[PDB]
Amino acid sequence: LNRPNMVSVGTIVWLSSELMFFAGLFAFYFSARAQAGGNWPPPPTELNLYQAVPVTLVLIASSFTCQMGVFAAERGDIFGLRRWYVITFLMGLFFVLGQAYEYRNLMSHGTSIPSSAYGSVFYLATGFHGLHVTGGLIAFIFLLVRTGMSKFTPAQATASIVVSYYWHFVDIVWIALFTVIYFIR
Amino acid sequence: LGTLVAFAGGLIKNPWKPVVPTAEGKKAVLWTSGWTPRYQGETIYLARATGTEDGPPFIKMRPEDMDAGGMETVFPWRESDGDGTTVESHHKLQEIAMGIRNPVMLI
Amino acid sequence: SSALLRTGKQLFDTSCVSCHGANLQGVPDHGPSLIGVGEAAVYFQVSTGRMPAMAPRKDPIFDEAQIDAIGAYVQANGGGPTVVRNPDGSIATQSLRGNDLGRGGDLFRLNCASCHNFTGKGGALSSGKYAPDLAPANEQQILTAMLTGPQNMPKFSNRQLSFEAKKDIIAYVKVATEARQPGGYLLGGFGPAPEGMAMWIIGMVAAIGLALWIGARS
Amino acid sequence: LARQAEDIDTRYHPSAALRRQLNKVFPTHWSFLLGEIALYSFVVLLITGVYLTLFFDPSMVDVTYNGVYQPLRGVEMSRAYQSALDISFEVRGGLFVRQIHHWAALMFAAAIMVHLARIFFTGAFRRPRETNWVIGSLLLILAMFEGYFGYSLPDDLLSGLGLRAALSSITLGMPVIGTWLHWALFGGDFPGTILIPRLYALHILLLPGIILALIGLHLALVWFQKHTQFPGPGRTEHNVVGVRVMPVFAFKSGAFFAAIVGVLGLMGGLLQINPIWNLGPYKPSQVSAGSQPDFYMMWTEGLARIWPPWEFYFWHHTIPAPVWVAVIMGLVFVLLPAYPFLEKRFTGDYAHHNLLQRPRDVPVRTAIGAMAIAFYMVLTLAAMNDIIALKFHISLNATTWIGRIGMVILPPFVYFITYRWCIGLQRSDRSVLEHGVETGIIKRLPHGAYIELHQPLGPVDEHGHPIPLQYQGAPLPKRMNKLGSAGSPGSGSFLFADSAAEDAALREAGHAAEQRALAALREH
Numbered sequence A: 001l002n003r004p005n006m007v008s009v010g011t012i013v014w015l016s017s018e019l020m021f022f023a024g025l026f027a028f029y030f031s032a033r034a035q036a037g038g039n040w041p042p043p044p045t046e047l048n049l050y051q052a053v054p055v056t057l058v059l060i061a062s063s064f065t066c067q068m069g070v071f072a073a074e075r076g077d078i079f080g081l082r083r084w085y086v087i088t089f090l091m092g093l094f095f096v097l098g099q100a101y102e103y104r105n106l107m108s109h110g111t112s113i114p115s116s117a118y119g120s121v122f123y124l125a126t127g128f129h130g131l132h133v134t135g136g137l138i139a140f141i142f143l144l145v146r147t148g149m150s151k152f153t154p155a156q157a158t159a160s161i162v163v164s165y166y167w168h169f170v171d172i173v174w175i176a177l178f179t180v181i182y183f184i185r
Numbered sequence B: 001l002g003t004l005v006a007f008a009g010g011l012i013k014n015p016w017k018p019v020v021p022t023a024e025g026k027k028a029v030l031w032t033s034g035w036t037p038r039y040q041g042e043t044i045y046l047a048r049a050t051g052t053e054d055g056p057p058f059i060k061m062r063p064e065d066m067d068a069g070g071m072e073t074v075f076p077w078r079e080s081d082g083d084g085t086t087v088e089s090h091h092k093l094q095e096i097a098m099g100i101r102n103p104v105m106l107i
Numbered sequence C: 001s002s003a004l005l006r007t008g009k010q011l012f013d014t015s016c017v018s019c020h021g022a023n024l025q026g027v028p029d030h031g032p033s034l035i036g037v038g039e040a041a042v043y044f045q046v047s048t049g050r051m052p053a054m055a056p057r058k059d060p061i062f063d064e065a066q067i068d069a070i071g072a073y074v075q076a077n078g079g080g081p082t083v084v085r086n087p088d089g090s091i092a093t094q095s096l097r098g099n100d101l102g103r104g105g106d107l108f109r110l111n112c113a114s115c116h117n118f119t120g121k122g123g124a125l126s127s128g129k130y131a132p133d134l135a136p137a138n139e140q141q142i143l144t145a146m147l148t149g150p151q152n153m154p155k156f157s158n159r160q161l162s163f164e165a166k167k168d169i170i171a172y173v174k175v176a177t178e179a180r181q182p183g184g185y186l187l188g189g190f191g192p193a194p195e196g197m198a199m200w201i202i203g204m205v206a207a208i209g210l211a212l213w214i215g216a217r218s
Numbered sequence D: 001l002a003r004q005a006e007d008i009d010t011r012y013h014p015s016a017a018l019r020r021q022l023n024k025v026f027p028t029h030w031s032f033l034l035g036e037i038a039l040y041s042f043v044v045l046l047i048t049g050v051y052l053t054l055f056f057d058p059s060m061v062d063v064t065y066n067g068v069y070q071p072l073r074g075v076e077m078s079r080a081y082q083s084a085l086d087i088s089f090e091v092r093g094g095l096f097v098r099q100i101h102h103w104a105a106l107m108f109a110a111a112i113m114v115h116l117a118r119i120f121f122t123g124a125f126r127r128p129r130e131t132n133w134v135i136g137s138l139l140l141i142l143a144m145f146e147g148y149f150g151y152s153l154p155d156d157l158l159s160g161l162g163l164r165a166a167l168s169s170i171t172l173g174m175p176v177i178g179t180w181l182h183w184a185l186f187g188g189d190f191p192g193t194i195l196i197p198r199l200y201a202l203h204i205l206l207l208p209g210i211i212l213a214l215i216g217l218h219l220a221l222v223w224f225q226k227h228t229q230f231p232g233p234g235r236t237e238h239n240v241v242g243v244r245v246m247p248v249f250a251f252k253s254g255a256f257f258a259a260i261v262g263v264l265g266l267m268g269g270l271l272q273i274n275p276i277w278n279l280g281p282y283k284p285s286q287v288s289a290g291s292q293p294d295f296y297m298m299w300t301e302g303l304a305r306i307w308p309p310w311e312f313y314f315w316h317h318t319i320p321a322p323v324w325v326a327v328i329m330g331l332v333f334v335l336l337p338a339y340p341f342l343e344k345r346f347t348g349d350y351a352h353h354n355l356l357q358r359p360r361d362v363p364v365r366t367a368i369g370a371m372a373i374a375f376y377m378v379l380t381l382a383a384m385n386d387i388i389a390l391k392f393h394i395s396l397n398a399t400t401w402i403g404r405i406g407m408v409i410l411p412p413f414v415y416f417i418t419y420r421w422c423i424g425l426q427r428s429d430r431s432v433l434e435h436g437v438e439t440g441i442i443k444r445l446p447h448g449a450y451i452e453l454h455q456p457l458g459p460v461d462e463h464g465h466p467i468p469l470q471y472q473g474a475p476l477p478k479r480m481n482k483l484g485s486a487g488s489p490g491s492g493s494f495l496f497a498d499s500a501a502e503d504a505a506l507r508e509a510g511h512a513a514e515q516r517a518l519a520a521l522r523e524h
């Protein structure tokens, strides 16, 4: 019974709506970018390439570990699932501390939210991504707590899988944003 | 009854006895506010507060020193009080400062 | 200067003529005459974002030194209090700060604290308008606003209050708000009502959670 | 040690009474700990107050500060405020201790209010324990008055204004006696040289001692007369179900005391309370929006605020409005201990009861409780009008009118709503009694129907539909997971599983233990 899973399609359409939310955010950012000529970033701003790439590597490694957790998930093993999810949670927490440190460094040297338009749009674009990453960590915590309180059912596996490709979607949108910002400029 | 009456006798006071001297004899505290003249013709200035210790706590007030929407606080002066130099004058100034029914607005 | 002031006030018809008239006559329906107030009134009412509205604070409209032009225009039209300036061509910033604090604090608790607050936060008035918080206030605008007498605020003359009194008042205002509270997290500077709210929302919840954890339900 | 026990037994010969009390059994329920919290808070207040008394000086002679707080140097001020500033700033950790004291007092007030509410809801105020209810009412009134006297010793602008307004206006407003009481209390006019020492003495000596003695009396009464218990499987009106003292009861009490001290200390260290240094010394000429005193007598302030201005004028006399406020608060005081007599002479019930009733069973009492709590909440929130209009841009007059009209119109609405709510809860309980609890599973029934597949809770008829049960006033589960269906996952800790034999042994041992406990409770 129930050859497809309604949770799957529900999460798919929810991620679609969130993808359009990020579409709106990208629309805000790309607007007025061409309105400034030459050095369209303000000089009181210089992105640290030596610190942005490591967090991207962190996130892609976390996504790969999450996929390994999924592969453990479709079969009857909960403990490896918990181990992989804990590794992913720690990796994401390290990432979050990474952009927190970047945030502290950036405002300390001029540019702030009310300072320049470029700073405002960059801060707005990154803030929603950070909030969604924190929500994903909360989802990890809730799901891992739920696993150890009762028996194992296909519903638990479905929840794990939907959270997993929600995280994968987060990784994809983050790498797209990184390519937009640090490379195309 | 005798013991309880003796025990309760330490708190009873008359709120209607004349203790405060006035210009028409002596009146109870509740009927006075410190603005009552004391010898029928005293000159009392609407002195305003200053907040400084070296300078007098209250200084006299001139009509020109106001504005169309100015709010000020004044207190009775009683020139015989004097400025806050001697101990008696300072204590009298503090006494006139600590009065519930003393402060008056002038708008 | 004066011609540039006329350009920025009247020829910049976005600002002046729509409510007070080209000759600063003052249309009785909307606004006042605006003929006896000095440049200080304009400086305070413009630099603090209290710009024409449809009036809580907002972003300023004119900032690129044209506020000085507007002040010069209005002071030429009619006399009044003027902005206190630093002896170098700029506006005084720290020379206005005084030294005495006890007298300043006493004056604050005698005339300032009544509307604003004990600690300078927002205060509550009747029928709409209120008392704004003094946290976003800057000292020059503080002195100018006192000397100007804005809406619902008693106007204060330099004759009745000494200049040293203004220095002490602004010194106390800047000390009270900018100093770290030596009692941990602050709770808005109000009375014990937020304290009771915090007790009901935190102490009660944690206490009943610990009671449920320790106890059993049956 | 054996020798010490032998000597103690040979000297005082205590074994029997000690065995009697040590074998006492106490009921087990989370709602039964809402008095221990208040008692522990009381202990905290007592210890802190013992500490604070070593650095205070209650004198109203004017002095100069010349201490360490620069923005307050060279100002005429009361001695007591100087001592309070000394305790706050010039003693290592004194501010922490006084903040703990104030927070603990608020803890005490909230705990006593919650405990009274739970007692009123459970309906334990019947014939066997009416004097306990009267004593509790007296305790509440005395504690409220003591708390009012608490925040007034450091006579700042807030405390001075509050005490001035309340005491002076109410006492001077008395119709017949009036000025006599005020002059006796203050020794003349309002600002007296003896007021603060008298208040300090009353706050340290009389009220705390009376409160402690009455609390001991209440605890002794609840000790002798055995505690009630909720209805259950092995519960009856002639026995008490629970645990003994030695292995559980005292240990849980100590752990709860430690936890409550912990939360008090944490939240005291985190939250600033009553920053008197930010305030100023009390003077008659200084006043501002600073109002709304402590939140456990705030209802009196709200009642004073909302009351309409009615006055009477006859031959050279005048009765002001606040006399009505005094009448209302006196009637509220009177009604609190008189409620059980009214109930027992209204319903005509004179039967003993050792078993409580769940809140949804009795609609009328719950409706009256909702009446009272809604009235108290609307009165309390009315007094916070200024902050309402400040934080949220609302008209002050509009909010005052809203409170005034709501004090009359809201009570009947919530009364009717909670009556309907209780009736609906009873209906739902009857419905879940009639059929099996819903399992949340549907079946296709190839002929074309859909069924709930109720799980029966007991006997089943020949048709498969469980026979109706009877209501015994006992709670029943409304969710499948509440009863044992599928739980207790693998024996791993957080990352690594254990041996299968160990997990199976643990599972069977736990199931056997729970089944044995349930069988022993049900059969006996």
Ligand code: HEC
Residues within 6 Å of the ligand: C014, C015, C016, C018, C019, C030, C031, C032, C034, C037, C041, C042, C045, C046, C051, C052, C053, C070, C150, C151
């Ligand atoms: C009607 C829209 C409107 C416009 C346009 C407007 N104001 Fe006002 N402002 C008011 C009104 C109305 C008042 C009267 C008092 C109040 O409402 O606070 C006022 C008050 C003032 C005050 C303080 C009160 C006083 O008597 O001086 C000053 C100064 C002032 N306006 C100057 C200006 C200046 C300078 C401009 C051009 C930048 C301007 N106004 C344009 C609305 C406006």
Ligand code: HEC
Residues within 6 Å of the ligand: C048, C050, C055, C056, C057, C111, C112, C114, C115, C116, C125, C129, C130, C131, C132, C133, C134, C136, C137, C141, C142, C145, C146, C150, C151, C152, C153, C154, C156, C169
């Ligand atoms: C309730 C009567 C009242 C009194 C008393 C009063 N104020 Fe004001 N004041 C106001 C009102 C109302 C405003 C805001 C008006 C507006 O925003 O249009 C204001 C404005 C201010 C501002 C400007 C804040 C800002 O962000 O622009 C400061 C600073 C200030 N007051 C401080 C003081 C000082 C200093 C005193 C003592 C001289 C004082 N208040 C006494 C009514 C009062």
Ligand code: HEM
Residues within 6 Å of the ligand: D045, D046, D048, D049, D050, D052, D053, D056, D098, D099, D101, D102, D105, D143, D146, D147, D148, D149, D150, D151, D153, D154, D203, D204, D205, D207, D208, D211, D274
């Ligand atoms: C009976 C319950 C009590 C209540 C409701 C109560 C109420 C209060 C309150 C509200 C304060 C203000 C706290 C503060 O400002 O930080 C206070 C302070 C104080 N209380 Fe109590 N108190 C109680 C018991 C005691 C006891 C038993 C003592 C000791 C005899 C005591 C002595 C003090 C002292 C010395 C202070 C000064 C500390 C201060 O105000 O900062 N109190 N009390």
